[PDB]
Structures are given as C-alpha cells and as structure tokens.
Design a protein around this ligand. Structure first.
Ligand code: NAP
Ligand code: NTI
Length: 316
C-alpha cells in the first residue's frame, strides 16, 4: 500500500485526510494541529463548513513551528452552490484562501453540481421547500474553475457529488482545458459506488470517499438508522484483525485505491484513525464489505430533488 495517489495534474494526494464538516470553530484548530502531528498531510475543508478560519490557524501555527512545510500539506476546499456564476468563482476561491491564510489550494472542488441563487443564504428555499436555483450550468462553472489553475490560485480542480453523466459532460466539454483531478463522493459499505468508482478510475480521475464511518454525527440521524460503526458483521471483521471498526471502515476504501477523509475532533480518534497502514483486509473481507451495499445515502440533498442538475436520479 502506497500513501499517496498520483493525480492527473502531476501532483501526489495523500490517501488519508482529515474531514472537517461539523468540527466546531472552537475545536477544529486543535483537531487539525493534532492531525498534523500524528502524520495527516491532507485536510478536507469547505466554505460551507463555517470553520475555514480556524482550520487556517492550525495550519499557520504548524508552519510557524516548523512542524511541516506548505509543500508537504495537501489542502482541499470546495466552491459553494451560491457561487457557481462564472463571475463569482474567483472571488469565492479568494475568500476561502483568505480564511485559510494560504497562497494556494492543492485542490478546489465544485461542492455540488447544483447552482443556487446567488446571495447571502447558503440554502435559499421556497414555499415548497425546494431550493431556488441559479441560471448556471456545470460547463460554464467548470470553465471558471479552470481559470483558477492558470492564475495559480489552485493546483488542481475537481468535482463532488457528480454522477457519471455529469463527469462525462465535463470530459466532453467544448474547449475543455483541464480534466477534473478528483470526484469526491459518499462511499462506505452501505453505498459502495462500484460503477461510479470504476468509471472515474478508468478516466484517470481519483475518487475521494466521504462519510466513510457513516457520519454518525450527521444532524439528521434517527434511532432507526443503520450504523456502520455498530454493524456486528463489521465488528467481527475488526475483531479478527485486532482493529477498531473505524479502522476497518477507513482501510476499506484505501484498498480500493480511493482517498478517504474520516472526520474527528477527538485527539485519540484522530490518532486512532491514522493507524491504518499496519494491517490489510483480506480479499474476502473486501468482497464481504462490498456485499453490504444498500444504496443508502447520508447526503441525498433532498431539498434539491427537482434541480436540473440533481445528481442522484441517475443510476450512477
Ligand atoms: N463533498 C461533500 O459533499 C461531503 C459530504 C460529507 C462529508 N464530506 C467530508 O467528509 C468528511 C467525513 O465525513 P463525515 O464528517 O460526514 O463523517 P465520518 O467521517 O464518516 O464520521 C464522523 C463522525 O465519526 C466520529 N468518529 C471519528 N472517528 C471515530 C472513531 N475512531 N471511533 C468512533 N467514532 C469516530 C466523529 O466523532 P468526533 O468528531 O466527535 O470524534 C464524528 O461523529 C467530512 O468531515 C467532510 O470533510 C464531504
Ligand atoms: C437538512 C438540514 O438542514 O441539515 C442541517 C441541520 C442542522 C444544521 C445544519 C444542517 C445542514 O444542512 N448542514 C450542512 N452543512 C453543509 C452542507 N452541504 O454541504 O450541503 S448542509
């Protein structure tokens, strides 16, 4: 097992990163500092997580402490849906850079394929509970992303929650300058993404697996919901390797050649989640974990099912 994957921009991306969605501003600074100390060199961020300033403080302090050099870190952020208009893309990126206190991002993703009405609401909704869309399309937004590479603001650009037809649309864009480097998608044993992964990987697009532990702190979690961390089949596999269930769930996408980004603000867990390079899941473990697929999504973007670019109508 190698620790980094080669992207189609020629850069290498650490296969393990720290997630920061739901990491409070008052805890994420310590969380990122601890991650850096124990060996994480990839942090997954987003404007919409409302904590990029506090992530940037942690990064800046570790650089000042000479713990790590900038070129050794791989920092990822994401363009929010209200900024899909070509004229707003650069300014959204610069705002993220200012918050993170960085000169450049290693990777900037379109967070969702769906553009939302521009303004001061992350999620403009109407009386039907549906999102107010913007007059944008993914190809024009992609063109604006491409300019950020030429302007040196980001080293790589990519997409998130795009289905394979949406990836194909970009790959066939008239005037395409840069292929997406990464498609970041939800992936875990209840949503195995076999076709979308095979598709992206066949195109040289690296897949990042999000919510690998099943996002147990997701704000919409219900007692009747399944739980990967408490799944007794997965506990059994973990017991066999003398590892925790979290460690199995993190190692699982790694062996499929995916990048994986488990989130924690707990120092012991941040350390524990990193201890995944000292064992291997067997071929049958992998086949068994894949058999648990139920196409069960934590992030289904249910407020946008009528948006023209809603990604989860298609099979994959
Ligand atoms: N592109 C997108 O649209 C998108 C969507 C969702 C997520 N993401 C990214 O993916 C990252 C990870 O996904 P996620 O935050 O949804 O959930 P996740 O990483 O699957 O799970 C996070 C939850 O698991 C807990 N946890 C972490 N390590 C644990 C361990 N060793 N044992 C027991 N519990 C543990 C955390 O608790 P504590 O924090 O309290 O320790 C937190 O409650 C996000 O933070 C974000 O960066 C991206
Ligand atoms: C359904 C709903 O309203 O869930 C919530 C309940 C409480 C607090 C926050 C959310 C929420 O939607 N948070 C998000 N952060 C990032 C998001 N993204 O990237 O799409 S959505």
């Amino acid at each position: 097992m190698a620790s980094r994957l080669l992207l189609n921009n020629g850069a290498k991306m650490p296969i393990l990163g720290l997630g920061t969605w739901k990491s409070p501003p008052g805890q994420v600074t310590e969380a990122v500092k601890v991650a850096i100390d124990v060996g994480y060199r990839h942090i997954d961020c987003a404007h919409v997580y409302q904590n990029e300033n506090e992530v940037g403080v942690a990064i800046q302090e570790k650089l000042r402490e000479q713990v790590v050099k900038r070129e050794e870190l791989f920092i990822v952020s994401k363009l929010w849906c209200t900024y899909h208009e070509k004229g707003l893309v650069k300014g959204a990126c610069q705002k993220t850079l200012s918050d993170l206190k960085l000169d450049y991002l290693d990777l900037y993703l379109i967070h969702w394929p769906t553009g939302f009405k521009p303004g001061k609401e992350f999620f403009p909704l109407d009386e039907s509970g549906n999102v107010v869309p913007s007059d944008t399309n993914i190809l024009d937004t992609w063109a604006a992303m491409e300019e950020l590479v030429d302007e040196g603001l980001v080293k790589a650009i990519g997409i998130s929650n795009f289905n394979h037809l949406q990836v194909e649309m970009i790959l066939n864009k008239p005037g395409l300058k840069y292929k997406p480097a990464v498609n970041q998608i939800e992936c875990h044993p209840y949503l195995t993404q076999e076709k979308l992964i095979q598709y992206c990987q066949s195109k040289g697009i690296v897949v990042t697996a999000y919510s690998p532990l099943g996002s147990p702190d997701r704000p919409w979690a219900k007692p009747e919901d399944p739980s990967l961390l408490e799944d007794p089949r997965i506990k059994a596999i973990a017991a066999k390797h003398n590892k925790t269930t979290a460690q199995v769930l993190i190692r699982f996408p790694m062996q499929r050649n995916l990048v994986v980004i488990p989130k924690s603000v707990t120092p012991e867990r941040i350390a524990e989640n990193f201890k995944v390079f000292d064992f291997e899941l067997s071929s049958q473990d992998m086949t068994t974990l894949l058999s648990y697929n139920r196409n069960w999504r934590v992030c289904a973007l249910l407020s946008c099912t009528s948006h023209k670019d809603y990604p989860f109508h298609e099979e994959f």
